[PDB]
Amino acid sequence: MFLQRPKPYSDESLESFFIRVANKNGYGDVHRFLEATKRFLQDIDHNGYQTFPTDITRINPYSAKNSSSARTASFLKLAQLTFNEPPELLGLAINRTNMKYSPSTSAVVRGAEVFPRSLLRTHSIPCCPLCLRENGYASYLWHFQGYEYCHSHNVPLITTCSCGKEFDYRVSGLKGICCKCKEPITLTGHEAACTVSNWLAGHESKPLPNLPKSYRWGLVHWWMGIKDSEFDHFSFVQFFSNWPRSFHSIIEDEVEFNLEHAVVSTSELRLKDLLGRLFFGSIRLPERNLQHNIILGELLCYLENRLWQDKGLIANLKMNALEATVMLNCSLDQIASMVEQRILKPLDVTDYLFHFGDIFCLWLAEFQSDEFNRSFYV
Amino acid sequence: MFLQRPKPYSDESLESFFIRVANKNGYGDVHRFLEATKRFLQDIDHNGYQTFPTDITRINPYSAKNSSSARTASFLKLAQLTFNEPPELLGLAINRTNMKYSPSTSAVVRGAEVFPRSLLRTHSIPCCPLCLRENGYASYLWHFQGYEYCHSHNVPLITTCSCGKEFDYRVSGLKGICCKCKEPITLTGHEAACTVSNWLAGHESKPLPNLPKSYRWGLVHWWMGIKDSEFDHFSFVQFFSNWPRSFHSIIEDEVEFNLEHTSELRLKDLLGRLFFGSIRLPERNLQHNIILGELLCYLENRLWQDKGLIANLKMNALEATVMLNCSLDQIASMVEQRILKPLDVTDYLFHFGDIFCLWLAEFQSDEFNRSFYV
Ligand SMILES: [Zn+2]
Ligand SMILES: [Zn+2]
Ligand SMILES: [Zn+2]
Ligand SMILES: [Zn+2]
């Protein structure tokens, strides 16, 4: 099998890539192209040729249950032999990863952008009938929640055509011709999400900060837990006009509430009981790089400064051997090694034996890194 | 107690900070200030006042046995109480850190710059008396080997004066007046170390790459294991001078010594020195750990060449966690569900053509990922 590469684009999705290859090389559709792709992998002695799907829906590496390792091994072999010039297809596929958010939100990766798994769309993919006729391809941002508006047009994406039927570009082509009435879809102008859709594109909008593509998705899963609802876009804009003093407006509310509503005495207080929501909700977004995770990197500033104010209230919060490992970015064995030789002053892991100012000052002298340290937010 | 901040600098050592305070504010030497400082912590009931040193040698937080957590806890109080405008003292200390190098070298950290533990000077700190008269304070680079020449005057660093006696700023102040002679010290041109110490400082100097301060210092440990000797400043410049074909020139010769010394060949038997000595130096940022990405770019275009020679090189489950940056529990999890294909942990049932395809599918990150060396 000898193919030709179409016009390359760094923002084209994976499902939009196989459609443009089959239309350029004279194939009928994408279903007959993936069937001939499976036939070529059988002839070249591939290990997972029988697991290659013929559907454009499950062509992504996260849809594979156990054959994910043979999926990109099939993707790497096609880029080296079936084209005159080697394309870039591994950077366009959504790969799984072991990276988690706080407290337990899973995440995936696509090249140099770590996507949240919880913000991935799986029911219906929206699209735009303008970019599919001007750019000639589909954006990779159409598969995720949050990119509700088209970024440089001040229009939303479409979900249902004028005759009651939906349009999905994966099953009905990249032109924009719907299934039932075979017409182009009529469109259905704010700023509250046009600021967001410009910012979730990876681009600059003020006052929202300059961050990598992964670390702008990290604010979105966090801010949904703030409202305890779905994402609100205009309150996202107004919240960072007072950055960080709207986040300073939050932590003042959160320590002053749970001291009132403390059920135990002020010496028997725990870190999870005063600040179990704020501190355990910003650790890995996606990592502990406080140079880009500005949430925890600011949270540390409003924790270190007031430590020994108010009789050392914050610096004396009880902690387990469990949540000592969460803050230090270590394991339970390194806690159990520092109770033998007593670098760390004191085993039951779930019995509250430690203090917060003890664990906070241990990080600053024994457990920093080139990203998770005190010297970026200062 | 109530003091004054001097002119604050972005390269002052920590030992120079307790002399520029102790001279200015009416103490006799550095010993008097440390003795006064320890008592102060007793009055405000700090827990580790009894571990606070009266020696300026052991002032750094790695010199503590168990009280390194209470030494920066002693340091987190003085910047808030005993001054007018808070000085930067935690940004000057040499803290420990857990960032292991290749193969097992530990690390220390001073703010946002991580150093090899094996490159710390401990006998006698060389210095430049021209910075000890015009700047008058001690640059933190003087605490480390690899830095031999002063990069601000192109003049060497002194270790033994004209009377056969040494010189150190922790015992002879910051003026430059020695012990035996109490004179100005008589001084002691190259380029090969001059441009390294300009690169070791944190400026842009060619042909040494634009790496960060954590990664400009991760290479000097790596090259001394290559030559297996003391550090030659001449060859460390000329090694980077023909990138990539000087770095590849050892690589294509590493295989030829180890091909002759074919399926029972291993990745530890054929590419064992280049790969296992380059994973974390200090970390896995392939934008700035250029050693792995260029070797991966060498070995991505060598995966199924030579009838798949490099695809047939054997790996364990222990040395697969070194690559994939995971634990042994996730390795045994991929054996039950059978994503990675062949329990004995040190078993040779895993090959390099099998591991590298799994990392492009299930184990990327934002820094240990293919998205830089494309
Ligand atoms: Zn567009
Ligand atoms: Zn229509
Ligand atoms: Zn000088
Ligand atoms: Zn002398």
Author numbering:
A (entry chain J): 1 to 188, 193 to 350, 360 to 391
B (entry chain I): 1 to 188, 193 to 265, 270 to 350, 360 to 391
Passage from the reporting paper:
Recently, bioinformatics analyses have revealed the presence of CRISPR–Cas loci in bacterial Tn7-like transposons, thereby implicating a functional relationship between RNA-guided DNA targeting and transposition, with the latter representing a new role unrelated to host defense. Support for this concept has emerged from recent functional studies on type I-F and type V-K effectors involved in sequence-specific DNA transposition, thereby significantly broadening the potential biological applications of CRISPR–Cas technology. To complement the available functional studies, our efforts have focused on structural studies of the Vibrio cholerae Tn6677 multi-subunit type I-F CascadecrRNA–TniQ complex, whereby transposition subunit TniQ initiates DNA transposition with the eventual help of other transposition-associated proteins TnsA, TnsB and TnsC in the gene cluster. Here we report cryo-EM structures of a V. cholerae type I-F CascadecrRNA in complex with transposition subunit TniQ before (binary CascadecrRNA–TniQ) and after (ternary CascadecrRNA–TniQ–dsDNA) target double-stranded DNA (dsDNA) binding at an average resolution of 2.9 Å and 3.2 Å, respectively.
We could observe only 5-bp of PAM-proximal duplex DNA with 2-nt overhang at the 3′ end of the non-target strand (NTS), and a traceable 32-nt target DNA strand complementary and paired to 32-nt spacer RNA, but no clear density for the PAM-distal duplex segment, which is adjacent to bound TniQ. Arg243 forms a wedge and stacks with PAM G (–1), facilitating the formation of crRNA–target DNA heteroduplex and displacing the NTS, thus leading to the onset of R-loop formation. In line with this concept, we observe that TniQ forms a head-to-tail dimer whose individual monomers simultaneously bind to Cas6 and Cas7.1 of the CascadecrRNA complex, with clear density observed at the interface between TniQ and both Cas6 and Cas7.1. One TniQ interacts with Cas6 via a main chain polar interaction between Val268 and Asn16, whereas the other TniQ interacts with Cas7.1 by multiple polar interactions between side chains over a larger interface (inset).
